[PDB]
Amino acid sequence: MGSITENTSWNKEFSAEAVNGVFVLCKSSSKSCATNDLARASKEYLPASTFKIPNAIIGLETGVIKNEHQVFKWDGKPRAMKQWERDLTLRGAIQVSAVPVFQQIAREVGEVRMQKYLKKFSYGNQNISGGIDKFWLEGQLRISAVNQVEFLESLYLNKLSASKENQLIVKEALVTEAAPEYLVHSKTGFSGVGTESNPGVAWWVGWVEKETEVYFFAFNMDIDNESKLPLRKSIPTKIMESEGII
Amino acid sequence: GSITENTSWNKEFSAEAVNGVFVLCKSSSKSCATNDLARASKEYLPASTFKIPNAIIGLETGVIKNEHQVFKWDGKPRAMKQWERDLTLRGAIQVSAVPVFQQIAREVGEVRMQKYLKKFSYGNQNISGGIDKFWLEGQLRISAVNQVEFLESLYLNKLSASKENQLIVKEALVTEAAPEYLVHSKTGFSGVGTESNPGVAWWVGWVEKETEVYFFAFNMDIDNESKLPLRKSIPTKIMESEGII
Ligand SMILES: *[B@@]1([O])OC2=C(C([O])=O)[C]=[C][C]=C2[C][C]1[N]C(=O)[C][C]1[C][C][C]([N][C][C][N])[C][C]1
Ligand SMILES: *[B@@]1([O])OC2=C(C([O])=O)[C]=[C][C]=C2[C][C]1[N]C(=O)[C][C]1[C][C][C]([N][C][C][N])[C][C]1
Ligand SMILES: [Cl-]
Ligand SMILES: [Cl-]
Ligand SMILES: [Cl-]
Ligand SMILES: [Cl-]
Ligand SMILES: [Cl-]
Ligand SMILES: [Cl-]
Numbered sequence: 094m095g096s097i098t099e100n101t102s103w104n105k106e107f108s109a110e111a112v113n114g115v116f117v118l119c120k121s122s123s124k125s126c127a128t129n130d131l132a133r134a135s136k137e138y139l140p141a142s143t144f145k146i147p148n149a150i151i152g153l154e155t156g157v158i159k160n161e162h163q164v165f166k167w168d169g170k171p172r173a174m175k176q177w178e179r180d181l182t183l184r185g186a187i188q189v190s191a192v193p194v195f196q197q198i199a200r201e202v203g204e205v206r207m208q209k210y211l212k213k214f215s216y217g218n219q220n221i222s223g224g225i226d227k228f229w230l231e232g233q234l235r236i237s238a239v240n241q242v243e244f245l246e247s248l249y250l251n252k253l254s255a256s257k258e259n260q261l262i263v264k265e266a267l268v269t270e271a272a273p274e275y276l277v278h279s280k281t282g283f284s285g286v287g288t289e290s291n292p293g294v295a296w297w298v299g300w301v302e303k304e305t306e307v308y309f310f311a312f313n314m315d316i317d318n319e320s321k322l323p324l325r326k327s328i329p330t331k332i333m334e335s336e337g338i339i
Numbered sequence: 340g341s342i343t344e345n346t347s348w349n350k351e352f353s354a355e356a357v358n359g360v361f362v363l364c365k366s367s368s369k370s371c372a373t374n375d376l377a378r379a380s381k382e383y384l385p386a387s388t389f390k391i392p393n394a395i396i397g398l399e400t401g402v403i404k405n406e407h408q409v410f411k412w413d414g415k416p417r418a419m420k421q422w423e424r425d426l427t428l429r430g431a432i433q434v435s436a437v438p439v440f441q442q443i444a445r446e447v448g449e450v451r452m453q454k455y456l457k458k459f460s461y462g463n464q465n466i467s468g469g470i471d472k473f474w475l476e477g478q479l480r481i482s483a484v485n486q487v488e489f490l491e492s493l494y495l496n497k498l499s500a501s502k503e504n505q506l507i508v509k510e511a512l513v514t515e516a517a518p519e520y521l522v523h524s525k526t527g528f529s530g531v532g533t534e535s536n537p538g539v540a541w542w543v544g545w546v547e548k549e550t551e552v553y554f555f556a557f558n559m560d561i562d563n564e565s566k567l568p569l570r571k572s573i574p575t576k577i578m579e580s581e582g583i584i
């Protein structure tokens with residue numbers, strides 16, 4: 094969403110770490126968002142592994158993914174990361190961002206069905222050019238932090254163009270922290286270290302349920318070195334702690 | 340299914356002088372291990388562990404309208420301060436808000452309640468003693484083995500309820516989330532009991548890890564609230580020593 098306001102007091106967490114990024118935090122009850130940088134909140138970036146959220150819903154809706162108990166078998170051939178070399182459930186693949194698992198899902202979904210669902214979802218620029226199994230990693234697909242929070246709100250309310258059962262399945266898989274006072278659903282993303290003078294992007298998106306309130310958030314930053322990855326969680330976490338949400 | 344005794348876990352009980360049982364089953368309930376065969380099948384007051392089937396029944400009957408329903412507090416005194424506030428379904432389950440589920444049970448009614456406990460094969464299915472308290476001081480009894488069987492059905496979406504409603508309840512039961520494993524669980528506590536008849540404390544749930552699942556159920560005699568943390572520390576130590584964590 095209903096409104097958005099700039100809160101430049103959040104810039105302290107960024108400049109303390111020398112990070113160029115944006116944080117968007119929306120309070121569901123009031124339909125109001127706050128961000129440290131309006132301009133970057135609307136800038137569109139490669140979603141990277143955050144795309145595993147819509148990709149998982151689409152895989153379920155199309156039947157490519159049978160259910161949350163399907164085991165994605167490893168065929169024993171080398172993968173890019175050791176943590177991907179094992180059988181995985183849907184949650185396990187999401188948790189380790191198992192690219193080849195979701196590349197296979199995308200191929201089976203196909204270009205036509207993928208295009209349909211991103212229009213239904215209003216997901217970014219909806220441009221899936223560049224290869225059916227790479228458009229979210231190195232293609233032309235772009236999405237903003239504001240779009241991410243809007244998309245995640247629809248998922249939370251089960252308002253996406255998909256069965257409630259399938260949206261619930263994917264929500265169960267995104268739980269990342271459970272405390273007595275609150276519950277966190279989130280997904281990380283990382284496009285890489287980018288080229289010279291053209292850094293990559295790192296994401297952290299999700300929502301926080303605390304008491305009877307719901308907070309949707311989206312963070313992204315420029316990243317040129319793999320070691321800066323933890324900042325995509327520490328900076329949002331510190332902001333949300335300063336807001337009393339933890 | 341068969342129940343197998345595991346004598347090595349008794350060390351955790353004896354160090355604390357606790358009379359209780361731990362049941363742990365990998366993959367399924369077909370083969371469960373325990374420290375005490377007799378107590379593993381002994382039926383006890385379920386206490387607040389009954390909020391699991393009660394929540395499923397509330398959703399199946401429409402008493403609970405949807406996953407996002409807020410249980411408003413009318414402002415009048417409740418036994419515990421953590422209950423004196425508006426609560427979601429997860430919130431009510433996490434603080435064990437008795438008043439919320441008492442009203443749910445009253446709206447469900449005895450006939451529908453009996454129907455669903457028969458479908459769930461939930462313990463002795465005896466709901467006598469008051470619709471808003473048969474699980475707290477009534478005749479309902481359930482064993483650790485029965486709890487594991489019931490939790491396995493819920494895990495598989497095999498209970499007599501929509502998969503949607505079972506998913507809603509499972510989401511409300513998440514208590515620990517780590518990159519390596521996910522824990523769903525619920526605590527229970529009937530009180531300190533009468534003279535020579537102690538209360539019961541519960542911890543039941545399951546652990547999802549790699550491509551494997553582990554179902555567990557713990558109960559213990561309790562006559563002093565100071566012993567309550569043992570209901571999680573004993574099973575936690577056992578599951579830690581087994582590498583489940
Ligand atoms: B995805 O963006 O998510 C992801 C993360 C994450 O959640 O931030 C961490 C590690 C891998 C992945 C897979 C997806 N990202 C990529 O595929 C880009 C790729 C991943 C591996 C990196 N290897 C560094 C060199 N040793 C290079 C970029
Ligand atoms: B329920 O069993 O869950 C519950 C727990 C728990 O998670 O085990 C802890 C505290 C309260 C509750 C509510 C439900 N149990 C009861 O209503 C019986 C009540 C429990 C507290 C006892 N007094 C302890 C002193 N602080 C007396 C009986
Ligand atoms: Cl909003
Ligand atoms: Cl842009
Ligand atoms: Cl980009
Ligand atoms: Cl790979
Ligand atoms: Cl909560
Ligand atoms: Cl990495």
Ligand SMILES: [Cl-]
Binds near residue numbers: 322324326
């Ligand atoms: Cl990280």
Ligand SMILES: [Cl-]
Binds near residue numbers: 364365
């Ligand atoms: Cl085991």
Ligand SMILES: [Cl-]
Binds near residue numbers: 382383
């Ligand atoms: Cl009893």
Ligand SMILES: [Cl-]
Binds near residue numbers: 418
């Ligand atoms: Cl009360």
Ligand SMILES: [Cl-]
Binds near residue numbers: 564
């Ligand atoms: Cl207490």
Ligand SMILES: [Cl-]
Binds near residue numbers: 567568570571
């Ligand atoms: Cl405890």
